[PDB]
Structure formats: C-alpha cells, structure tokens
C-alpha cells in the first residue's frame, strides 16, 4: 500500500454531515464555559 | 517575525507560553508540577492579602489572627486557604520529587535543574518552619524554640550565635517581628530561584515517561497543554474547596488554636504532617549534633543521587527490580512518617533505626548494584551465541 491508500478511520467517524452540527455544539459549549469562568472570576 | 514574535515583550511569552516544544507522551504528572507552581503563587497572593490585614506585635498577633478570622468579611476563608494551600503545596512537592526520581529525570541533561530543585526544597522546608513560627500559639513558638535549641548545637560556639539569631536570652518584639519579616521575605527568594528553575528547564527541555529521546515529535504547549493544565487545576481546586469548606481544619492539628501562653504545653505535641519523616531521622540517631548533620545528609542526599546511578537505560519503567525497590523505598518513607507520628518506646525505636538504615543504604548502595545487575542481565539475555 502507498500513501494514497489511506488507513481506515471509520471507528471514530460520525454521521456524514460535517456541517454546523458539531461546530455549533462546540461553540455553544465553549461559550458556556466562558460564562462559568467569567462568573467565578467576577 | 509576526507581531506576536517580533515584539520582544510578546516574544518572551511566545517562547514560554504561546509556543514551546513539549513531547507528546506527557502523562498527568508534569501538569502536577505546573499545578505546584500555580498553588505556590496562590499562596503568595493570599499571603500578600494577609500581610495587608495582619499585625505581628505580641500584644496583637493573636488579636490580629482572630480579627482576620472573625471581624472581617471573607476573612476565615483566607486562613483556611493558607492552611490547605500549605498542605497541598508540600504534598505536590513530594509528588513532583517522586515523579522526578522514578522516571530518571535527574540524569545528565538536567543535572543543574536537579540541584536547583534540591536547594529549593532545602530552603522551602526552612521557610515552612518559619511560617509555622509566625502563628505564636501554644505550640508554634514552642517548635520555634525547639529549632533554636537544635541550631544551638554548632561546635566550638554555643552562646553568641544563638543569642544573635534568637534576639537575646528572651523573646520580645524584635524576635517575632523579624521571624514574620523573614517568613515574608524567603518566598521571594523561592520565586527568584523558581524563575531560575524554569529558565534551566526551558533551556534543557523536558523528559518523557518512556525514558527515550523526545525530539522525534513535539507539539506546542498552548492550545494543547494549557487546557490539560486547566482541567488538572480545576480538579485541584475542587479538592481544595472540599477541604476548605466542608472540613477546613482537618489537615492541620487542633493545637494551634490556643492564645499565646508558653506556660503549660499541651499533652499532644507533634510536628506538621510534612515533617514527620525528618523528625524520625532525627530521633533515630542517638546524638544531637550528629542527628542534625544526618538530617541534613538525608535532605541533601539527592545532590549525590546523580552520578551514582550507573543504569544505562534512563528511567525505571522497563526495569522491574529497580521499581520494586523504589516502591519499597516510598513505603519505607511513609512508614517512617507514621512511626514518627506516634511516640518513642519499645519496639518502635528498633524498627525506626532499621528504617533509617535501609533508607541510607538504599541510596548509597542498592541502586548502583541492582542497576549493574540489570545492565549485565540485559546484555546476557539478548545475546545467545
């Protein structure tokens, strides 16, 4: 096998969307994390 | 040269925080050292607040501590944070030393770092005692007098040096005032020497749990290790909150809470939990000056620990006898602490002396010989021709 034959990654891949689904979730959670950190610091 | 790295002030942060090539095999043991540094600076800042709201005169020292305890908003929290932070500081220092010793990080690349750390420990145990003196209870000044009598064991002079250090044959305002001032000052030397420690670290890099070269792969510390540090310090802060709020005065001993009265000592007098093994090493050897020098030898043996381990393979993960004896060593250390906690009678003295003997014999003898056996076994087993 050469470099072009990419090894399988199906074990961790998810639904074939690759869109704002994960992005919005992650951004919203980090926004909440900033909320909690700011509240604690204040 | 972008703005982050072209500007010298931002370039200094860039080389340390924004971008620094740590290896990718780091366990959860190095963020423990970063946690050590951060809890150290937390102790410094709460000490600054205390010094802002503290008075050191004998007529008001206990008055000041009870006023900051009771008659000020968010006051008792400061004292509880001081106690728990000191306890966690020594616990994390012991964990840092154990990680350094087990993974073979005292070897040639960072010997200078090892001595810097050793002297940090040598003087921070001193500053911990000095802070313990500042309480001025029925046992704090008591242990302070104990340590002064210990230091009075210098040969060829006994009176002039102890009188100069202890401010005369009595205790008055200058003695406690200078003790508080020096407990305030020594942590600044801690900070400077820690700056030196980090400089040496950044110059020489970091080791790996595998005990092998780490230059093959590296990753920036920011955006990868900053959040690991954040999660480990969040765990530490949760634990500290549990021990500061629900059960604040548990790690400490219920003896400090007595007004200044060096008349009748309490029935139970023991050192703080981070000093019991050294009290044991003092108690074992039946001599005063020789006991002091053997305490200092036990403290400083880490200096002679390098260039004594002739194991060719760095670390202790792949060697079984060495790590077995290392676990024997750490359990001997905890046993020494536990036996120092209790009183001195038969048959505790015999096994305490045996424990000190196996401690020093471990360091000075067993690791060289078992490491030589490990190397010769490594050579013989592989070669079958």
């Amino acid at each position: 096998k050469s470099t072009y034959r990419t090894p399988n990654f199906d074990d961790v891949l998810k639904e074939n969307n690759d869109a704002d689904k994960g992005r919005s979730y992650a951004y919203f959670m980090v926004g909440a994390m900033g909320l909690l950190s700011s509240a604690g610091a204040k | 040269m972008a703005f982050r790295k072209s500007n010298v002030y931002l370039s200094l942060v860039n080389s340390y925080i924004i971008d620094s090539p740590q290896p990718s095999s780091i366990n959860y043991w190095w963020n423990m050292g970063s946690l050590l540094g951060l809890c150290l600076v937390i102790q410094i800042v709460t000490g600054i607040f205390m010094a802002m709201h503290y008075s050191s005169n004998i007529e008001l020292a206990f008055s000041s501590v009870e006023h900051i305890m009771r008659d000020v908003h968010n006051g008792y929290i400061l004292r509880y944070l001081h106690a728990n932070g000191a306890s966690f500081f020594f616990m994390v220092m012991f964990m840092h030393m154990a990680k350094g010793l087990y993974y073979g990080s005292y070897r040639s690349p960072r010997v200078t770092l090892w001595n810097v750390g050793v002297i940090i420990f040598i003087l921070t145990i001193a500053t911990a005692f000095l802070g313990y003196c500042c309480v001025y209870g029925q046992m704090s000044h008591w242990g302070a007098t104990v340590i002064t009598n210990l230091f009075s064991a210098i040969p060829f002079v006994g009176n002039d040096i102890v009188s100069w250090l202890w401010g005369g044959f009595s205790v008055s305002n200058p003695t406690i005032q200078r003790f508080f001032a020096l407990h305030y000052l020594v942590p600044f030397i801690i900070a400077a020497m820690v700056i030196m420690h980090l400089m040496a670290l950044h110059i020489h890099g970091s080791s790996n749990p595998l005990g092998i070269t780490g230059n093959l792969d590296r990753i920036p510390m920011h955006s990868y290790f900053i959040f690991k540090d954040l999660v480990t310090v969040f765990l530490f802060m949760l634990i500290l909150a549990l021990f500061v709020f629900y059960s604040p005065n548990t790690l400490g001993h219920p003896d400090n809470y007595i007004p200044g009265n060096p008349l009748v000592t309490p029935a139970s007098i023991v050192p703080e939990w981070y000093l019991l093994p050294f009290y044991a090493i003092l108690r074992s050897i039946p001599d005063k000056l020789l006991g002091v020098i053997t305490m200092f030898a036990a403290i400083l043996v880490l200096l002679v620990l390098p260039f004594t381990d002739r194991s060719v393979v760095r670390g202790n993960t792949f060697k079984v006898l060495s790590k077995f004896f290392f676990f024997i060593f750490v359990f001997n250390f905890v046993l020494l602490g536990q036996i120092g906690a209790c009183h001195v009678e038969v048959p505790y003295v015999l096994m305490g002396q045996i424990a000190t003997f196996i401690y020093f014999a471990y360091f000075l003898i067993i690791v060289p010989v078992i490491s030589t056996i490990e190397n010769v076994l490594f050579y013989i087993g592989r070669v079958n021709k």
């Binding site: 050469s2 959670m29 950190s37 | 009771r70 008792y76 959040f227 969040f234 909150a241 709020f245 629900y246």
Partner: protein
C-alpha cells in the same frame, strides 16, 4: 468557635457545584480538541537503498 457554619456551607455548596461543572466542561473540551492528535496514525515505508 465558628460563627460562620451556615454561610460557610452555603458558599461551599455553590463552589463545589460550580467547580464540578467547570471540571466536567474541561473534561469534554480536552477530550474534544485532543481527538485530532490522539488518533493520528503513522505508516513506515522503507526508503529506496541509495544514499
């Protein structure tokens, strides 16, 4: 000996709640942004024999 038990316990409950939330949050985010580095795979192809 301790005229702050009620206030101490209330503040401690709030603190343990907020730190537990922050700790779980940090767990998720660390497992998130380390996912791209904890799964990368290496393949070794021996080079051609010519210095």
């Amino acid at each position: 000996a301790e005229p702050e038990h009620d206030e101490r316990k209330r503040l401690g409950l709030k603190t343990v709640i907020i730190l537990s939330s922050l700790y779980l949050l940090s767990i998720w985010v660390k497992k998130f942004k380390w996912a791209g580095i904890k799964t990368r795979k290496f393949v070794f192809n021996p080079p051609k024999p010519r210095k």
